[PDB]
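Complex 198.
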Amino acid sequence: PQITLWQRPIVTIKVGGQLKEALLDTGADDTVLEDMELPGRWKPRMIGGIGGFVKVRQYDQIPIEICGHKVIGTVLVGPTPTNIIGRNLMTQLGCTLNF
Amino acid sequence: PQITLWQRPIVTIKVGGQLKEALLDTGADDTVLEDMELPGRWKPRMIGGIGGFVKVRQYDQIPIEICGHKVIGTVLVGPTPTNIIGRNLMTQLGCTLNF
Ligand SMILES: CC(C)CN(C[C@@H](O)[C@H](Cc1ccccc1)NC(=O)O[C@H]1CO[C@H]2OCC[C@H]21)S(=O)(=O)c1ccc(C(N)=O)cc1
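Predicted structure with G08 bound:
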């Protein structure tokens, strides 16, 4: 669709068998999800933002369904205050910024 | 313009007489710039980023030139990893996200 930015661009996603709301975020290189269970091996990272850094687990090749579209990519899991869909998945949707 | 998301959507802005690089950030409610000096009075504000809450200076009705367009609105100034243009100004650009 065409999503305006008058409000937060929040969409419903399905990941790890769980349904949740997440923010379409052009300012995020990668997708970052609030603490949840995911299968497989992971690697520790530190990612930085406005309040400083948060410790996350990096999972690779995680399928996520976003607005009825199945995409796959890197997901970072940790104590983020909100679920963020980053550029690494938005590209798979063919999502662009337009003005 | 149409901006794909394979790379960071960075643009040059002109603000307070200076040129700066800034990130078009749909995950940001607000526009947040690194320490700067802007005219007029400021008001206290606390914002919550990925790492926690941060004190910033809120300046109102600041003109910024972005991609050839003049926007005028609220600018928060404080410790940020990068200058971010949030939805408050992107709406003035007429920015939308599209599939
Ligand atoms: C600040 C930018 C440069 C990076 N951040 C993405 C932003 O869009 C970040 C996303 C977000 C984090 C926490 C709560 C709500 C939204 N937004 C963000 O910090 O916005 C600030 C300014 O306006 C306010 O509205 C929402 C929170 C406040 S990030 O910190 O969340 C981030 C950092 C690293 C990565 C990564 N390494 O992939 C991904 C995301």
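The pocket of G08 is lined by residues A 25, 27-30, 32, 47, 49-50, 81-82, 84, 86; B 23, 25, 27-30, 32, 47-50, 81-82, 84, 86 (CB under 6 Å).
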